[PDB]
XYZ file of C-alpha atoms in Angstrom:
596
model
C 52.304 8.152 -12.972
C 49.646 5.409 -13.212
C 49.749 1.773 -11.598
C 47.780 -0.217 -14.656
C 47.577 -1.028 -18.361
C 44.106 -0.722 -17.804
C 44.260 1.927 -15.462
C 46.026 3.786 -18.217
C 43.298 2.938 -21.173
C 41.229 4.051 -18.401
C 42.050 7.827 -19.042
C 43.006 8.043 -22.195
C 40.516 6.521 -23.941
C 37.008 8.469 -22.255
C 39.198 11.560 -23.308
C 40.420 10.541 -26.982
C 36.287 10.326 -27.031
C 36.162 13.790 -26.178
C 38.164 15.419 -29.374
C 36.352 12.975 -31.711
C 33.117 14.385 -30.462
C 34.157 17.606 -30.462
C 35.917 17.974 -34.128
C 33.363 15.865 -35.324
C 30.651 18.566 -34.272
C 33.266 21.399 -35.004
C 33.792 20.120 -38.294
C 29.669 19.884 -39.180
C 29.435 23.428 -37.699
C 31.586 24.506 -40.972
C 29.579 23.425 -44.034
C 29.405 26.096 -46.377
C 25.670 27.020 -47.243
C 25.657 28.615 -50.843
C 29.547 28.770 -52.132
C 29.567 29.049 -56.118
C 30.576 25.884 -58.481
C 31.729 25.345 -61.884
C 32.228 21.924 -63.455
C 35.749 21.462 -64.985
C 38.370 18.694 -64.991
C 42.140 17.891 -65.138
C 40.809 11.520 -66.445
C 41.500 12.229 -62.630
C 38.810 15.197 -62.719
C 39.442 18.419 -60.255
C 38.359 21.938 -60.774
C 37.214 24.432 -58.992
C 35.814 26.304 -56.060
C 36.545 29.792 -53.782
C 35.665 30.023 -50.128
C 35.629 32.353 -47.336
C 39.224 33.114 -46.470
C 39.271 31.626 -42.710
C 41.861 30.628 -40.585
C 42.415 28.139 -37.796
C 44.730 25.594 -35.830
C 43.893 22.324 -38.023
C 43.234 23.662 -41.218
C 42.035 22.277 -44.541
C 45.564 20.226 -46.119
C 45.505 17.862 -48.810
C 44.550 14.796 -46.841
C 40.741 16.235 -45.950
C 37.641 14.763 -47.617
C 34.420 17.468 -49.158
C 31.452 16.744 -50.463
C 28.469 18.649 -52.395
C 25.307 18.778 -51.490
C 22.440 21.251 -53.643
C 22.293 14.916 -56.537
C 24.911 14.238 -54.023
C 28.735 13.610 -54.419
C 31.702 12.841 -52.297
C 35.212 13.209 -53.405
C 38.386 14.592 -52.077
C 40.979 17.954 -51.923
C 42.901 18.504 -54.480
C 43.592 22.236 -54.217
C 44.354 23.934 -50.980
C 45.199 28.309 -51.395
C 48.536 29.242 -51.791
C 50.640 31.375 -53.490
C 49.241 30.430 -56.986
C 45.880 31.276 -57.086
C 43.895 30.442 -53.433
C 40.639 28.474 -54.561
C 39.724 24.883 -53.679
C 39.231 22.163 -56.053
C 38.057 18.347 -55.214
C 38.243 14.912 -57.254
C 34.677 13.296 -57.722
C 34.887 9.495 -58.194
C 32.032 9.341 -59.424
C 32.124 11.143 -62.263
C 29.198 13.379 -61.832
C 25.853 10.479 -61.857
C 25.302 24.201 -62.778
C 25.668 26.438 -59.770
C 24.742 27.427 -56.838
C 25.722 24.676 -54.045
C 26.469 23.500 -50.454
C 29.559 22.367 -49.008
C 30.274 20.123 -46.087
C 33.943 18.722 -44.979
C 33.351 15.258 -44.498
C 34.257 13.929 -41.292
C 37.327 11.214 -40.344
C 37.336 9.041 -37.187
C 40.498 7.034 -38.024
C 43.080 8.968 -36.375
C 40.614 8.715 -33.403
C 39.494 4.926 -33.580
C 43.663 4.122 -34.253
C 44.277 6.234 -31.105
C 41.755 4.400 -29.255
C 42.805 0.098 -30.713
C 46.182 1.804 -29.658
C 45.271 2.012 -25.656
C 43.685 -1.453 -25.837
C 46.505 -3.147 -27.308
C 48.643 -1.490 -24.295
C 46.084 -2.884 -22.090
C 45.293 -6.482 -24.075
C 48.676 -7.237 -25.379
C 51.397 -8.498 -23.676
C 53.826 -7.871 -26.328
C 53.201 -4.747 -27.290
C 56.159 -3.321 -25.327
C 58.900 -4.497 -23.348
C 58.605 -5.069 -19.658
C 60.854 -1.923 -19.218
C 58.950 0.276 -21.432
C 55.865 -0.847 -19.909
C 56.866 -0.062 -16.261
C 58.628 3.312 -17.300
C 55.710 4.486 -19.666
C 53.260 4.158 -16.748
C 55.886 5.762 -14.173
C 56.238 2.382 -12.201
C 59.835 2.432 -10.201
C 62.200 0.699 -12.210
C 65.755 -0.748 -12.379
C 67.674 0.767 -15.608
C 68.387 -1.946 -18.467
C 71.219 -1.767 -20.426
C 70.685 -2.934 -24.082
C 73.006 -5.164 -25.525
C 74.472 -4.022 -29.266
C 78.097 -3.580 -30.723
C 78.762 -0.151 -30.487
C 80.306 1.501 -33.986
C 83.564 2.845 -34.432
C 82.553 5.356 -36.387
C 79.609 6.725 -34.849
C 78.979 9.392 -37.712
C 77.144 7.916 -40.667
C 77.793 7.233 -44.340
C 76.446 10.313 -46.404
C 75.555 12.570 -43.324
C 77.187 15.278 -41.549
C 79.769 14.502 -38.607
C 78.575 14.984 -35.136
C 79.912 17.343 -32.547
C 80.289 16.140 -29.558
C 76.309 16.334 -28.166
C 75.622 14.703 -30.848
C 77.919 11.804 -31.035
C 76.910 11.465 -27.110
C 73.167 11.258 -27.603
C 73.496 8.289 -30.591
C 76.611 6.894 -28.253
C 73.728 7.371 -25.286
C 70.539 6.382 -26.954
C 71.427 3.218 -28.297
C 72.606 1.385 -25.541
C 69.096 2.334 -23.210
C 65.311 1.075 -23.955
C 63.800 4.342 -23.620
C 65.650 7.665 -24.574
C 64.615 11.139 -25.019
C 66.734 14.119 -27.151
C 65.806 17.531 -26.843
C 66.716 19.163 -30.413
C 66.615 23.216 -30.268
C 66.281 25.216 -33.929
C 69.094 24.459 -36.237
C 70.695 21.992 -34.031
C 70.651 19.356 -36.327
C 68.070 16.630 -34.835
C 67.253 15.428 -38.366
C 71.036 14.589 -39.089
C 71.187 13.255 -35.462
C 67.797 11.246 -35.447
C 69.023 9.789 -39.125
C 72.422 9.025 -38.037
C 70.744 6.975 -34.911
C 68.202 5.166 -37.522
C 71.397 4.015 -39.936
C 72.582 2.487 -36.692
C 69.641 0.599 -35.743
C 69.494 -0.116 -39.033
C 72.562 -1.768 -39.081
C 71.809 -4.070 -36.327
C 70.143 -6.298 -39.243
C 66.764 -6.699 -37.251
C 63.465 -6.082 -38.639
C 62.530 -3.025 -40.026
C 63.405 0.842 -38.190
C 59.967 2.295 -37.534
C 60.206 6.240 -38.114
C 57.640 8.180 -37.373
C 56.882 11.925 -36.759
C 52.988 13.638 -36.032
C 53.199 15.733 -39.728
C 53.974 14.958 -42.879
C 56.558 17.709 -42.871
C 57.972 16.445 -40.237
C 58.317 13.021 -41.921
C 59.275 13.718 -45.507
C 62.247 15.807 -43.909
C 63.340 12.842 -42.360
C 62.600 10.311 -44.954
C 65.106 12.492 -47.239
C 68.312 12.507 -44.633
C 67.920 8.005 -43.904
C 67.753 7.701 -47.622
C 71.039 9.721 -47.980
C 72.197 6.647 -45.677
C 71.773 4.076 -48.453
C 69.291 2.700 -46.954
C 66.459 0.710 -48.597
C 63.920 3.331 -47.321
C 60.004 3.160 -47.822
C 57.714 6.211 -46.870
C 53.830 5.045 -45.972
C 51.582 7.523 -46.901
C 47.684 8.086 -46.241
C 45.866 6.719 -49.579
C 44.335 10.479 -49.170
C 48.044 12.206 -49.520
C 49.447 9.964 -52.499
C 48.373 12.908 -55.349
C 50.876 14.832 -53.499
C 54.537 15.920 -54.622
C 57.690 15.872 -52.291
C 61.103 15.677 -52.518
C 60.608 12.017 -51.116
C 57.339 11.052 -53.555
C 59.645 8.004 -55.427
C 60.145 6.926 -51.433
C 56.743 6.109 -51.572
C 55.144 2.807 -50.945
C 52.355 3.855 -53.681
C 54.965 4.985 -55.914
C 57.492 1.889 -55.439
C 54.294 -0.349 -56.204
C 53.602 1.287 -59.647
C 57.229 0.773 -60.688
C 56.911 -2.895 -59.492
C 58.416 -4.354 -62.436
C 58.204 -8.047 -61.111
C 54.334 -8.055 -61.060
C 52.351 -8.423 -64.656
C 49.097 -8.466 -64.076
C 48.952 -5.965 -61.304
C 51.015 -4.032 -63.716
C 48.475 -4.169 -66.310
C 44.826 -4.315 -64.489
C 47.170 -0.555 -63.039
C 46.620 0.576 -66.462
C 42.902 -0.508 -66.819
C 41.838 1.583 -63.598
C 43.314 4.573 -65.030
C 40.602 5.027 -67.086
C 36.393 -2.437 -62.077
C 34.183 -5.341 -60.724
C 35.564 -8.906 -60.472
C 38.963 -6.977 -60.902
C 38.679 -5.160 -58.118
C 38.566 -8.250 -56.180
C 42.086 -9.272 -57.786
C 43.770 -5.758 -58.175
C 43.225 -5.315 -54.088
C 44.591 -8.021 -53.642
C 48.034 -8.350 -55.999
C 48.356 -4.605 -54.381
C 48.116 -5.860 -50.585
C 50.870 -8.346 -52.111
C 53.123 -6.020 -53.056
C 52.930 -3.598 -50.269
C 54.023 -6.339 -47.598
C 56.764 -7.194 -50.101
C 57.829 -3.999 -50.066
C 57.250 -3.177 -46.424
C 58.904 -6.683 -45.315
C 61.932 -5.709 -47.366
C 62.357 -1.999 -45.799
C 65.413 -0.893 -43.808
C 63.253 1.802 -42.696
C 59.743 2.705 -42.570
C 58.730 6.009 -42.667
C 55.519 7.312 -41.852
C 53.258 10.114 -39.790
C 52.520 8.971 -35.915
C 48.386 7.996 -36.926
C 49.988 7.057 -40.330
C 51.695 3.672 -38.063
C 48.374 2.622 -37.452
C 47.356 1.799 -41.425
C 46.021 -1.447 -41.596
C 48.959 -1.863 -43.901
C 51.267 -2.598 -41.017
C 48.807 -5.126 -39.298
C 50.590 -7.344 -37.833
C 54.376 -6.153 -38.668
C 56.630 -5.419 -35.318
C 59.123 -2.887 -34.856
C 61.589 -3.907 -32.514
C 63.235 0.118 -33.069
C 61.078 2.963 -33.374
C 61.997 6.665 -33.347
C 59.936 9.479 -33.552
C 60.677 12.849 -34.097
C 58.931 15.896 -33.426
C 56.899 13.851 -30.492
C 56.977 17.084 -28.659
C 54.505 17.959 -31.467
C 51.541 15.141 -30.595
C 49.131 14.031 -28.217
C 50.108 10.890 -26.152
C 47.988 8.406 -27.993
C 48.747 10.038 -31.385
C 52.187 9.405 -30.053
C 51.556 5.654 -28.656
C 50.464 4.812 -31.995
C 53.624 3.654 -33.009
C 54.970 2.798 -29.982
C 52.463 -0.352 -28.971
C 53.726 -2.145 -32.148
C 56.295 -3.969 -30.345
C 58.553 -0.950 -28.975
C 62.121 -2.559 -27.420
C 63.868 0.412 -27.588
C 62.247 3.743 -28.323
C 63.750 7.414 -28.966
C 61.725 10.438 -28.563
C 62.955 13.641 -30.206
C 61.555 16.703 -29.855
C 61.780 20.311 -28.298
C 58.700 21.919 -26.199
C 59.929 25.592 -26.952
C 59.155 24.388 -30.707
C 55.298 23.278 -32.596
C 52.894 22.059 -29.336
C 49.855 19.647 -29.787
C 46.902 20.900 -31.484
C 43.786 20.525 -29.275
C 40.850 21.361 -30.265
C 38.463 20.789 -26.921
C 39.552 22.797 -24.321
C 37.649 20.375 -21.986
C 40.155 17.345 -23.128
C 42.878 19.493 -23.464
C 42.797 20.846 -19.646
C 41.436 17.205 -18.374
C 44.680 16.126 -20.322
C 45.000 15.498 -23.666
C 47.119 18.438 -23.951
C 50.500 16.804 -22.787
C 53.413 15.254 -25.322
C 54.476 11.829 -24.125
C 57.823 13.269 -24.492
C 56.961 16.445 -21.703
C 55.220 13.679 -19.285
C 58.144 11.290 -19.200
C 60.630 14.724 -18.803
C 57.702 14.987 -15.389
C 58.439 11.599 -15.419
C 62.155 12.241 -14.353
C 64.118 11.246 -17.893
C 66.612 13.767 -18.675
C 66.776 14.629 -22.107
C 69.731 14.984 -24.083
C 70.173 18.773 -25.576
C 71.645 19.216 -28.967
C 74.077 21.626 -27.860
C 75.383 23.733 -30.851
C 73.272 25.914 -33.705
C 74.614 25.863 -37.108
C 71.522 27.812 -39.051
C 71.216 31.449 -37.745
C 73.948 34.820 -37.227
C 74.388 34.983 -33.514
C 72.464 37.959 -32.937
C 69.139 36.459 -34.453
C 69.702 33.301 -32.594
C 70.775 35.404 -28.941
C 66.967 36.235 -28.148
C 65.645 32.638 -28.573
C 68.871 31.508 -26.646
C 68.112 33.397 -24.085
C 63.910 33.148 -23.357
C 63.972 28.893 -24.126
C 67.403 27.709 -23.488
C 68.671 29.776 -20.606
C 71.508 31.287 -22.901
C 73.611 28.324 -23.185
C 73.081 27.432 -27.125
C 76.208 27.938 -28.752
C 76.809 29.137 -32.121
C 78.362 26.769 -34.737
C 78.414 29.651 -37.506
C 80.853 32.414 -36.475
C 79.441 35.908 -37.264
C 81.848 36.250 -40.215
C 80.465 33.058 -41.973
C 76.619 34.263 -41.553
C 77.662 36.959 -44.616
C 76.015 36.268 -47.897
C 78.270 36.136 -50.668
C 77.017 39.427 -53.043
C 74.804 40.770 -50.548
C 73.561 45.099 -50.543
C 72.157 45.725 -47.778
C 73.612 47.447 -44.717
C 71.660 46.816 -41.806
C 70.309 49.691 -39.149
C 73.480 48.692 -37.367
C 76.462 46.996 -39.045
C 76.929 43.951 -36.398
C 73.345 42.611 -36.538
C 71.057 41.164 -39.254
C 67.803 42.211 -37.725
C 65.592 44.777 -36.862
C 62.067 45.928 -36.144
C 60.155 47.889 -38.649
C 56.995 49.729 -36.765
C 53.801 50.389 -38.730
C 50.433 51.849 -37.084
C 48.320 50.024 -40.180
C 44.384 49.952 -39.839
C 43.096 46.591 -38.386
C 40.545 45.162 -40.859
C 37.760 42.269 -41.152
C 38.208 39.858 -44.052
C 37.230 41.080 -47.414
C 35.059 37.443 -47.492
C 34.841 35.082 -44.192
C 36.283 36.104 -40.589
C 40.395 36.309 -40.340
C 41.779 39.494 -40.647
C 44.161 41.414 -42.824
C 46.414 44.829 -42.359
C 46.887 46.875 -45.609
C 49.933 49.208 -44.732
C 51.796 46.417 -43.321
C 51.392 44.288 -46.227
C 52.270 47.567 -48.060
C 55.619 47.630 -46.143
C 55.869 43.361 -46.204
C 56.507 44.237 -50.181
C 58.952 47.225 -50.301
C 61.198 44.843 -47.676
C 61.039 42.125 -49.867
C 61.608 44.636 -52.532
C 64.714 45.701 -51.015
C 65.881 42.487 -50.157
C 65.862 40.859 -53.729
C 67.685 43.968 -55.473
C 70.472 43.197 -52.491
C 71.159 40.067 -53.925
C 68.625 37.623 -52.583
C 67.419 35.010 -54.349
C 63.094 34.911 -53.683
C 63.010 30.881 -52.855
C 65.019 31.788 -50.070
C 62.729 34.754 -48.829
C 59.648 33.466 -46.306
C 57.186 35.559 -44.888
C 55.211 34.405 -41.981
C 52.074 35.636 -41.022
C 49.304 34.097 -38.193
C 46.163 35.290 -40.950
C 44.972 34.022 -43.781
C 43.518 36.966 -44.276
C 46.990 38.405 -44.671
C 47.854 35.763 -46.532
C 45.417 36.113 -49.156
C 46.304 40.115 -49.675
C 49.936 39.357 -49.177
C 49.185 36.831 -52.865
C 48.000 39.217 -54.525
C 49.345 42.423 -53.999
C 52.848 41.233 -53.967
C 53.041 41.029 -57.998
C 51.079 43.955 -58.423
C 53.030 46.934 -56.403
C 55.972 45.009 -56.997
C 58.346 46.910 -59.299
C 60.320 43.654 -60.052
C 58.794 40.501 -62.559
C 55.812 39.193 -61.560
C 57.196 35.379 -61.537
C 59.627 35.931 -58.992
C 57.406 37.638 -56.428
C 54.998 34.439 -56.848
C 58.325 32.742 -55.872
C 58.142 33.799 -52.258
C 56.731 31.877 -50.001
C 53.847 33.365 -47.826
C 52.499 30.657 -44.849
C 51.504 30.213 -41.453
C 54.331 28.708 -38.865
C 53.090 24.924 -39.342
C 54.238 25.547 -43.263
C 57.639 26.447 -41.927
C 58.281 23.665 -39.357
C 61.875 22.540 -39.295
C 62.313 24.684 -42.965
C 65.320 27.296 -43.285
C 65.486 30.300 -45.526
C 67.970 32.747 -45.740
C 65.736 35.839 -45.079
C 62.335 35.705 -42.579
C 59.525 38.411 -42.967
C 57.000 38.482 -40.043
C 53.689 40.101 -40.362
C 51.618 40.726 -37.460
C 48.890 42.378 -38.422
C 47.670 43.576 -35.293
C 46.380 47.781 -34.412
C 43.649 45.792 -32.175
C 45.173 44.545 -28.438
C 42.080 42.173 -29.322
C 43.212 38.628 -28.225
C 45.665 37.163 -30.662
C 46.006 33.613 -32.145
C 49.400 32.459 -34.283
C 53.012 33.312 -33.084
C 50.862 36.426 -31.859
C 49.759 34.515 -28.011
C 52.004 31.652 -28.260
C 55.791 31.657 -27.093
C 56.780 28.226 -29.364
C 55.294 29.450 -32.175
C 57.047 32.388 -31.754
C 60.239 30.582 -31.235
C 59.857 28.817 -34.830
C 59.031 31.958 -36.155
C 62.303 33.925 -34.898
C 64.399 30.246 -36.063
C 64.048 29.626 -39.277
C 66.121 32.740 -40.899
C 69.839 31.753 -41.373
C 70.933 35.479 -42.507
C 68.157 38.285 -41.836
C 64.910 38.281 -40.125
C 62.241 41.779 -40.279
C 59.395 41.990 -37.809
C 57.013 44.312 -39.280
C 54.257 44.950 -36.708
C 52.419 47.477 -34.675
C 54.860 47.599 -31.199
C 51.962 49.011 -29.316
C 49.299 46.743 -30.047
C 51.799 43.742 -29.385
C 53.082 44.906 -25.610
C 50.625 43.480 -24.221
C 51.777 40.010 -23.885
C 54.868 39.306 -21.500
C 57.280 37.167 -24.396
C 56.337 40.141 -27.062
C 57.322 42.745 -25.070
C 61.016 40.804 -23.985
C 61.269 40.767 -27.625
C 60.904 44.526 -28.158
C 62.943 45.576 -24.995
C 65.968 43.405 -26.453
C 65.262 44.778 -29.800
C 65.555 48.647 -28.609
C 68.335 48.035 -26.508
C 70.351 46.017 -28.878
C 69.971 49.422 -30.516
C 67.387 48.318 -33.327
C 63.163 49.276 -33.794
C 62.823 51.705 -36.284
C 60.575 53.917 -38.546
C 60.590 55.078 -42.835
C 63.357 53.292 -44.719
C 66.707 54.819 -45.097
C 65.660 55.619 -41.071
C 66.859 55.171 -37.716
C 65.535 54.940 -34.120
C 61.972 54.527 -31.913
C 60.201 55.334 -28.955
């Protein structure tokens, strides 16, 4: 609603300063006083130590820096808890210059420093955004601007699915306006549409197109679709994130640079570091020339929002910018890319899906909690909704459509098309591939830490896992969601033991929070709500958005396991339970029936 660029930086700036102070202090408060360690290896050394199972909102992910006290040595996170033996290892960069230590979580200001310098440029730099973007971002009243361009004859792109009418219209409209919003409800084909938009923006031959999303998962998913059109795609990664796998690692800058057959000397110097002084002077220099060569030549650059603040992008201007999953980001974050020269900006997302995590309630309250997306809807830009969904069986989409998309969501797959070829699993109701299983297990504190678990519910999950596999379900196609790290640990260990089938087969099923499932689909989803308490919840327990994602990840079937009584007290969780009972599904003790 603002009036000036300085009046803009004026408000957000002091209020990014709250996140930065809060989390820097919060960070220093998660120091572990005396965990046990062991000197291992893997030379890129690594292994290992175990840490109190404790869930959060910003959890430790690979891309975090750590320190070891009790001699003083730093290093970065190599191993993070997941269904292959939850423990933590870190690569010391000083090859140890035994065995009761102290662990610190190093605080990095980069995310915030960049957000800070973004706002500054929005103030100091006249060439940071187009006049029209400049005025509209500050909420000024401006006459609409038409973007000149040649509309393609086919709106579909090369190596991508064809578009329905809502997608076509999104593409067609987006390409002709300087600022656009596209709301993309679950499985409505957001990233296809976005990739289709990017393809067209790239065919305009007109520098690299910039493409971002607040999370790495989100970028990767979109990097994968854009690549499918054949465009030259460079995917920028946090220098910190370089050792991580993805379906698109080969597209990543650091890798493309490693495969530079045209640069001897750098190729040489690279082998040596695989093991200095004056060599460090020239390795950095050639690496920089390598980076700029690929970045300059890309059709498309894909990174995080904070990602776009990277020094390596210095002094590059991006005229077309598409940010997907914008709804998931704070304004200052989402703004980091924008200030790199935007003249055409496309924000994609859904405020009914994952929202921005703010740690400092105070900053949250006083204005850090709102998307750029949301703030613009408020300012009156009408998002284009993607109308059809292709992921789930109608009954599975019914409840989410009704709560979030005012029951308007079309179904692109008929009930016929969502019966699994070879499934031997008749459901409590012959029509609806869903149910709620009732469990009154005992709530308990973590075996080591402060998160929570539930033994009975967990027991119940594994049998539902087993039953499903036996009907013909593939392990890679089954998910299990739980709000607690507690229940996550316990699921991992337990799954293989009381599991009748082969031990690796369960070990092939993914147990994660909601964040790990963002934008991903599976054939079956199991929820573990794990509450027998009425005590305030954290996951999809007390967040509609978070819950929406959970209910909209499966193609063929969704099974919810929880205490209907201990969750009823929450305006959305009861609408859920009520709707289920009416749909003649809410059950007890397998080979079962209805419940009260």
